[PDB]
Motif scaffolding. Structure first.
Motif, PDB file in Angstrom:
ATOM      1  N   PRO A   2       3.835  -8.543  -7.242  1.00 16.91           N
ATOM      2  CA  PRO A   2       5.078  -7.796  -6.956  1.00 16.91           C
ATOM      3  C   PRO A   2       5.704  -7.035  -8.122  1.00 16.91           C
ATOM      4  O   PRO A   2       6.835  -7.313  -8.530  1.00 16.91           O
ATOM      5  N   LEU A   3       4.974  -6.045  -8.632  1.00 20.80           N
ATOM      6  CA  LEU A   3       5.510  -5.102  -9.604  1.00 20.80           C
ATOM      7  C   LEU A   3       6.268  -4.014  -8.850  1.00 20.80           C
ATOM      8  O   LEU A   3       5.761  -3.476  -7.860  1.00 20.80           O
ATOM      9  N   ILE A   4       7.479  -3.691  -9.307  1.00 24.79           N
ATOM     10  CA  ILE A   4       8.418  -2.946  -8.468  1.00 24.79           C
ATOM     11  C   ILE A   4       8.055  -1.465  -8.406  1.00 24.79           C
ATOM     12  O   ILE A   4       7.723  -0.939  -7.337  1.00 24.79           O
ATOM     13  N   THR A  46       0.808  -1.214   0.000  1.00 22.70           N
ATOM     14  CA  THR A  46       0.000   0.000   0.000  1.00 22.70           C
ATOM     15  C   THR A  46       0.847   1.272   0.000  1.00 22.70           C
ATOM     16  O   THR A  46       0.341   2.362   0.276  1.00 22.70           O
ATOM     17  N   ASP A  47       2.135   1.154  -0.327  1.00 25.95           N
ATOM     18  CA  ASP A  47       3.000   2.319  -0.441  1.00 25.95           C
ATOM     19  C   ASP A  47       3.073   2.889  -1.850  1.00 25.95           C
ATOM     20  O   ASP A  47       3.595   3.994  -2.025  1.00 25.95           O
ATOM     21  N   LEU A  48       2.569   2.165  -2.842  1.00 28.02           N
ATOM     22  CA  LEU A  48       2.567   2.656  -4.210  1.00 28.02           C
ATOM     23  C   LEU A  48       1.512   3.753  -4.356  1.00 28.02           C
ATOM     24  O   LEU A  48       0.447   3.671  -3.731  1.00 28.02           O
ATOM     25  N   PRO A  49       1.772   4.790  -5.153  1.00 27.68           N
ATOM     26  CA  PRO A  49       0.924   5.989  -5.112  1.00 27.68           C
ATOM     27  C   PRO A  49      -0.422   5.779  -5.790  1.00 27.68           C
ATOM     28  O   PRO A  49      -0.593   4.950  -6.685  1.00 27.68           O
ATOM     29  N   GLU A  50      -1.394   6.565  -5.330  1.00 25.17           N
ATOM     30  CA  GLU A  50      -2.719   6.597  -5.928  1.00 25.17           C
ATOM     31  C   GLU A  50      -2.664   7.334  -7.260  1.00 25.17           C
ATOM     32  O   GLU A  50      -1.939   8.321  -7.418  1.00 25.17           O
TER      33      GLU A  50
END
Ligand SMILES: [Mg+2]
Ligand SMILES: [Mg+2]
Ligand SMILES: [Mg+2]
Ligand SMILES: [Mg+2]
Ligand SMILES: [Mg+2]
Ligand SMILES: [Mg+2]
Ligand SMILES: [Mg+2]
Ligand SMILES: [Mg+2]
Ligand SMILES: [Mg+2]
Ligand SMILES: [Mg+2]
Ligand SMILES: [Mg+2]
Ligand SMILES: [Mg+2]
Ligand SMILES: [Mg+2]
Ligand SMILES: [Mg+2]
Ligand SMILES: [Mg+2]
Ligand SMILES: [Mg+2]
Ligand SMILES: [Mg+2]
Ligand SMILES: [Mg+2]
Ligand SMILES: [Mg+2]
Ligand SMILES: [Mg+2]
Ligand SMILES: [Mg+2]
Ligand SMILES: [Mg+2]
Ligand SMILES: [Mg+2]
Ligand SMILES: [Mg+2]
Ligand SMILES: [Mg+2]
Ligand SMILES: [Mg+2]
Ligand SMILES: [Mg+2]
Ligand SMILES: [Mg+2]
Ligand SMILES: [Mg+2]
Ligand SMILES: [Mg+2]
Ligand SMILES: [Mg+2]
Ligand SMILES: [Mg+2]
Ligand SMILES: [Mg+2]
Ligand SMILES: [Mg+2]
Ligand SMILES: [Mg+2]
Ligand SMILES: [Mg+2]
Ligand SMILES: [Mg+2]
Ligand SMILES: [Mg+2]
Ligand SMILES: [Mg+2]
Ligand SMILES: [Mg+2]
Ligand SMILES: [Mg+2]
Ligand SMILES: [Mg+2]
Ligand SMILES: [Mg+2]
Ligand SMILES: [Mg+2]
Ligand SMILES: [Mg+2]
Ligand SMILES: [Mg+2]
Ligand SMILES: [Mg+2]
Ligand SMILES: [Mg+2]
Ligand SMILES: [Mg+2]
Ligand SMILES: [Mg+2]
Ligand SMILES: [Mg+2]
Ligand SMILES: [Mg+2]
Ligand SMILES: [Mg+2]
Ligand SMILES: [Mg+2]
Ligand SMILES: [Mg+2]
Ligand SMILES: [Mg+2]
Ligand SMILES: [Mg+2]
Ligand SMILES: [Mg+2]
Ligand SMILES: [Mg+2]
Ligand SMILES: [Mg+2]
Ligand SMILES: [Mg+2]
Ligand SMILES: [Mg+2]
Ligand SMILES: [Mg+2]
Ligand SMILES: [Mg+2]
Ligand SMILES: [Mg+2]
Ligand SMILES: [Mg+2]
Ligand SMILES: [Mg+2]
Ligand SMILES: [Mg+2]
Ligand SMILES: [Mg+2]
Ligand SMILES: [Mg+2]
Ligand SMILES: [Mg+2]
Ligand SMILES: [Mg+2]
Ligand SMILES: [Mg+2]
Ligand SMILES: [Mg+2]
Ligand SMILES: [Mg+2]
Ligand SMILES: [Mg+2]
Ligand SMILES: [Mg+2]
Ligand SMILES: [Mg+2]
Ligand SMILES: [Mg+2]
Ligand SMILES: [Mg+2]
Ligand SMILES: [Mg+2]
Ligand SMILES: [Mg+2]
Ligand SMILES: [Mg+2]
Lengths: 204, 122, 118, 137, 59
Positions: free
Chosen positions: D81-83, D17-21
RNA sequence: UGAGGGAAAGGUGAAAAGAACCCCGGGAGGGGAGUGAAAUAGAGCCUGAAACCGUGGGCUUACAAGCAGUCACGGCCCCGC
RNA sequence: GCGAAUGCCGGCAUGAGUAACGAUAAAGAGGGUGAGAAUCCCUCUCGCCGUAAGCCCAAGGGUUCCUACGCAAUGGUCGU
RNA sequence: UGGCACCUCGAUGUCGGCUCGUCGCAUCCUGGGGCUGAAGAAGGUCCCAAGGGUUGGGCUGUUCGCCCAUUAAAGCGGCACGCGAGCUGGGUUCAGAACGUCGUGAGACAGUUCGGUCUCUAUCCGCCACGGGCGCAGGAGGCUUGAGGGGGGCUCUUCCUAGUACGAGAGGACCGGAAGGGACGCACCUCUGGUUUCCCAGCUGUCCCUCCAGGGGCAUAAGCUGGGUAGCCAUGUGCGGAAGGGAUAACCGCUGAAAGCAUCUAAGCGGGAAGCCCGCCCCAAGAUGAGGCCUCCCACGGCGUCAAGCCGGUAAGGACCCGGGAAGACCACCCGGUGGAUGGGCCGGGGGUGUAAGCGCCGCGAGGCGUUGAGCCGACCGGUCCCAAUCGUCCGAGGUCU
């Protein structure tokens, strides 16, 4: 032959090292045992479980009044799990192991008085080309004078679903110990809330 | 997911431009055809100066479909139009430059010379 | 097969159903108590309770949302100015449904007696 | 509490949940990949994302791009798991959240209906995070 | 005259047997808690009127 | 259209003496009372059959297969010292 | 001298409490009359036609027009 | 194809196709085996075996038949040349019309062509499902064994063994293992894609609310367009056929006399198939042959033709009524009925829709900005007694005999 009482709570995807697995999360919690069978009493020698808690005022006491084991009577159908043998208190999920093939026997969705094309996967008549009223009809159901009568099981409309359905050879993905859950690999029979029993698959 | 009477678009330079496939080589009754599947197509329209004329009955492999390819990680991929590459009877493409993108299942289903020839493999 | 659809289909179509709830909202809010059939009432309560919960706000926009289904301004100002204050100390469910006996002669349908809670 | 998002929250303890909106604008998405035995060669993939069908854990989104005259679009689960999932130009102006109308018209008039935003540019550059507080004293 | 026709007529032992199921049940009649009359459950006593609250109109 | 075709429908009582009057019932319909040799002789009412529809009593049927009947044994019920 | 003539006439059955109840324009609510009201009268909403599902005549029909009193029969249910 | 003319002239609908099957083997393949002019593969023939499959198309009204691409195969027949109270009407077996021929002509042709009414209501048997009554020798709540019955009973490709055996070489296996497919069946909606009828947004014309703004009705039984959660599906996902045991058919045997030898047989013992029975799953004690186990209640409260088989309440329980449910045509099944979260409202979360109305600014204006991921919410998941299941009513054994 390991088995458990369970109830469907929904399904989702889990992620392994490379491939996603369409898991069904299923709540097979702590199941109290109430009665054991005996070869010298009944012969088939099964074990009677019951799983979900009941407050002791909706009972009617031919049911309330079982002895020392599981004094708090459960709600659902007290299923016997066919030669399984626990130690005597309850059956948790840790009887099962991840990587084993487990049978799931539940109660599928009754579609009502379901049709013959939706039920038995027929083809029916075309929509165009003069078709009077055959668009969903089954068609011919027999022959003239010999044999006469229609054979038994001609696969016509009726009550499709709402029967006890077994889906087999499901591999266990993950075990949740703190809430006593199981994660099977999809296609469980039953709706969200339908009770199942989960045995061991053979497939030897 | 291409069927009989389907106009595959040829992504190769063997002369053929648009082909119509009939029978899928999978078994007794091959209903559909995924990407990486050898089919038999008759050539409707062709460009001149090619070895593939009109009405030829050639074999091909499906490289792009508008219906998705479901990758086993849960992900999927779609394209814009149906495409095929004119393969021979010994599983070799007759053209030395394949147009556009192709899929990744051609690699794991045998074909390396097609994927090594495609510029941007998706 | 409505394995989860609530619906409350009433042998009518969509605009007759929504305009019917528009009419029974006006007829129930005009005189208070009402007497109708049972399945029309047991879904009409979910509409009139929605209108009263959209009457608890009173902020110039919920007035317009009341006016989307109540086209009488004199009925809406009577609703806000005479009904909205005395229900503010109640949370949800502003309508009681009590079934009425003495079924109709020409229809044989069970009666429903639906009124505002006191 | 027998059923719902608390049971479905147990299998969401590995969520990323750290990937941006992101709204439906242009972006680029790298991904892990398995071919020829080895699991190497992460792959970048830019384009305009069309549909945001967020649904609990297993959300999905589709990045379409034009590739050599062929519209190639892609279905991503956002939690596999896309980086890195970095947005190149935050165009946006998603008046329709499901902008499926692009697959008819494949031409230069994409960005005259999908214009560059100004708001998320303003709180993006205002939320650029470049505040040198780490070991500043 | 058309496609379904009775080949033979039903006798008394079949007509008087198919009528055996559909009979009227006696309606349940619980006593009214204030009125000395009978009434079906979960509805209004027509003289009582729910402990004389929202009743058939009195003076 | 027309030329033309073409029905069913008799019976109260000797005398209407055709049921005053009370009650239920909106009325109809009756229950009483009364007239009457008789009122199942009540007003399209003499005698009033059969098919048909019910009500009450005796016997028998929810493990038996038949153009449904005949014969035999037995059980149950009702007459007859 | 009747049991037969796809006989006739009159009655009553089966089909059976089954199909249908007549354009998928649409009804809902509060009062009044009344022994009895989804159907009658009044009021407030909703819908339909509006080159008519509106109005005026000639055909045609022959009191079907209005008022008052009633539901024996009729209105494809009830109906004051 | 015939011959006969035995029911059918108060009529038993004729060819073909679609849907739906079922059966026989004299087997098209898959499974075994003998022989071979069988070096191996591919073959030919014959014996057992019907368990499962037997494609998608063009041509003609066609059954049949001829071609295209595949497969291991695109089997032959019966069931009123199966199937019109299932459908189609393309041909033939209706009236119109025309062509070629015959006939002076009217007309005719088992010669050709265009067109040509295919009949809403299931009484009984059968079948698919669900019920009511009663029985199950005291009454109920559950659990469950299985006498018996159906489903599935498939099959191909690639690699190692192995380019080894065999064959000069071209070619190229038997035994066994691993992976992936084509069709069919069951279950699910998490991934993909649909529907989602008023859930949201936008828009045109008219009318109305009140002029502007903002709303409502109609333009379908959605006014159109774009989306759309739950639910229902496949175009998606997960599984299934088995692995194993017994008796076996063809076939291969061991021992062994009749018949001092020989012999699979006369005694016996074996091996031996997708075949049979086992095994998997559901249906199932109306399996009256009515099974088995656990638990609750039970003498009189009156009297026979005596332990109700003369009756009134009542224990355990059940039934009526209401809220409801992925349960459902009705019924039935399941959870509840104030000792409650069963439904509706509300709240919180998920999710659909996409910056609501109003205010301020810019622009003559249409419109654009900040307030604002706000406003609106049908179902998904919990909490809340705010409302509705208030009160209640009726059946129910009283424990027969060896
Ligand atoms: Mg259901
Ligand atoms: Mg179809
Ligand atoms: Mg039709
Ligand atoms: Mg027709
Ligand atoms: Mg027979
Ligand atoms: Mg619901
Ligand atoms: Mg109706
Ligand atoms: Mg969540
Ligand atoms: Mg009778
Ligand atoms: Mg006298
Ligand atoms: Mg008299
Ligand atoms: Mg008298
Ligand atoms: Mg008489
Ligand atoms: Mg008379
Ligand atoms: Mg006389
Ligand atoms: Mg007489
Ligand atoms: Mg009787
Ligand atoms: Mg028997
Ligand atoms: Mg008997
Ligand atoms: Mg006899
Ligand atoms: Mg006679
Ligand atoms: Mg006759
Ligand atoms: Mg007659
Ligand atoms: Mg009925
Ligand atoms: Mg009917
Ligand atoms: Mg019927
Ligand atoms: Mg009807
Ligand atoms: Mg109607
Ligand atoms: Mg009204
Ligand atoms: Mg009224
Ligand atoms: Mg009144
Ligand atoms: Mg009305
Ligand atoms: Mg005149
Ligand atoms: Mg006249
Ligand atoms: Mg007159
Ligand atoms: Mg009058
Ligand atoms: Mg009348
Ligand atoms: Mg009438
Ligand atoms: Mg009157
Ligand atoms: Mg013959
Ligand atoms: Mg003769
Ligand atoms: Mg006849
Ligand atoms: Mg004939
Ligand atoms: Mg004929
Ligand atoms: Mg044979
Ligand atoms: Mg042969
Ligand atoms: Mg063979
Ligand atoms: Mg060989
Ligand atoms: Mg067979
Ligand atoms: Mg077969
Ligand atoms: Mg036919
Ligand atoms: Mg017919
Ligand atoms: Mg027939
Ligand atoms: Mg024809
Ligand atoms: Mg025709
Ligand atoms: Mg002619
Ligand atoms: Mg009809
Ligand atoms: Mg029937
Ligand atoms: Mg039963
Ligand atoms: Mg069972
Ligand atoms: Mg069995
Ligand atoms: Mg039997
Ligand atoms: Mg069997
Ligand atoms: Mg979906
Ligand atoms: Mg959906
Ligand atoms: Mg209007
Ligand atoms: Mg209009
Ligand atoms: Mg409309
Ligand atoms: Mg309309
Ligand atoms: Mg020897
Ligand atoms: Mg032998
Ligand atoms: Mg043997
Ligand atoms: Mg053996
Ligand atoms: Mg609730
Ligand atoms: Mg949220
Ligand atoms: Mg959201
Ligand atoms: Mg919000
Ligand atoms: Mg809400
Ligand atoms: Mg919410
Ligand atoms: Mg709704
Ligand atoms: Mg909800
Ligand atoms: Mg809920
Ligand atoms: Mg809570």
């Amino acid at each position: 032959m390991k088995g458990i009482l369970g109830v469907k709570v929904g399904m989702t995807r889990i992620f392994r090292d490379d491939r996603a697995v369409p898991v069904t999360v299923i709540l097979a919690g702590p199941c109290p045992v109430v009665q054991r069978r005996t070869p010298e009493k009944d012969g088939y020698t099964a074990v009677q479980l019951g799983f979900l808690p009941q407050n002791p005022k909706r009972v009617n006491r031919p049911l309330k009044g079982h002895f020392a084991k599981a004094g708090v009577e459960p709600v659902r159908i007290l299923r016997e799990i066919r030669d399984f043998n626990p130690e005597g208190d309850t059956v948790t999920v840790e009887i099962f192991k991840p990587g084993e093939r487990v049978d799931v026997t539940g109660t599928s969705k009754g579609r009502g008085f379901a049709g013959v094309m939706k039920r038995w996967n027929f083809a029916g008549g075309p929509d165009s080309h003069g078709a009077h009223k055959i668009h969903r009809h089954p068609g011919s159901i027999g022959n003239r004078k010999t044999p006469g009568r229609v054979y038994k099981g001609k696969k016509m409309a009726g009550h499709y679903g709402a029967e006890r359905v077994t889906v087999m050879n499901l591999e266990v993905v993950d075990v949740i110990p703190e809430e006593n859950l199981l994660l099977v690999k999809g296609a469980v029979p039953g709706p969200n809330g339908g009770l199942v029993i989960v045995r061991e698959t053979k497939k030897a | 997911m291409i069927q009989p009477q389907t106009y595959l678009e040829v992504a190769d330079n063997t002369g053929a431009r648009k082909i119509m496939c009939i029978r899928v080589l999978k078994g007794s009754n091959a209903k559909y055809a995924t990407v990486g599947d050898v089919i038999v197509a008759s050539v409707k329209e062709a460009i001149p100066r090619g070895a593939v004329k009109e009405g030829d009955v050639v074999k091909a492999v499906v490289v792009r479909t508008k219906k998705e390819i479901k990758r086993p990680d849960g992900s999927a991929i779609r394209f814009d139009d149906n495409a095929a590459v004119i393969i021979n009877n010994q599983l070799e493409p007759r053209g030395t430059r394949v147009f556009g993108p192709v899929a990744r299942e051609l690699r794991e289903k045998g074909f390396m010379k097609i994927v090594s020839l495609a510029p941007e493999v998706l | 097969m409505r394995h989860l659809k609530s619906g409350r289909k009433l042998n009518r179509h969509s605009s007759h159903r929504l305009a019917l709830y528009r009419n029974q909202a006006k007829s129930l809010l005009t005189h208070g108590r009402i007497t109708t059939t049972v399945p029309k009432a047991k879904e009409l309560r979910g509409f009139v309770d929605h209108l009263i919960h959209l009457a608890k706000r009173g902020d110039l926009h919920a007035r317009r949302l009341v006016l989307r289904d109540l086209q009488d301004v004199k009925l809406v100002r009577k609703l806000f100015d005479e009904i909205a204050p005395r229900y503010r100390d109640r949370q949800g469910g502003y309508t009681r449904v009590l079934k009425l006996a003495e079924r109709r002669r020409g229809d044989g349908a069970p009666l429903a007696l639906v009124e505002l809670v006191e | 509490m027998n059923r719902g998002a608390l049971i479905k929250l147990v299998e969401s303890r590995y969520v990323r949940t750290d990937l941006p909106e992101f709204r439906p604008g242009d972006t680029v998405r790298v991904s892990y990949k398995v071919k020829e035995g080895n699991r190497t060669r992460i792959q970048d993939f830019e384009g305009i994302v069309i549909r945001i069908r967020r649904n609990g854990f297993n959300t999905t989104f589709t990045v379409r791009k034009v590739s050599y005259g062929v519209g190639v679009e892609r279905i991503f689960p956002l939690h596999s798991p896309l980086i890195q999932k970095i947005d190149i130009v935050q165009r946006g102006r998603a008046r329709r959240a499901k902008l499926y109308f692009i697959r008819n018209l494949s031409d230069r008039e994409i960005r005259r209906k999908l214009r560059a935003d100004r708001k998320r540019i303003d709180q993006d550059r205002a939320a650029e995070r470049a505040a040198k507080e780490e070991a500043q004293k | 005259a058309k496609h379904p026709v009775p080949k033979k007529k039903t006798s008394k032992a079949r007509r008087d047997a198919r009528r055996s199921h559909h009979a009227l049940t006696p309606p349940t009649l619980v006593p009214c808690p204030e009125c000395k009359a009978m009434k079906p459950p979960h509805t209004v006593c027509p003289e009582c009127g729910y402990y004389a609250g929202r009743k058939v109109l009195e003076v």
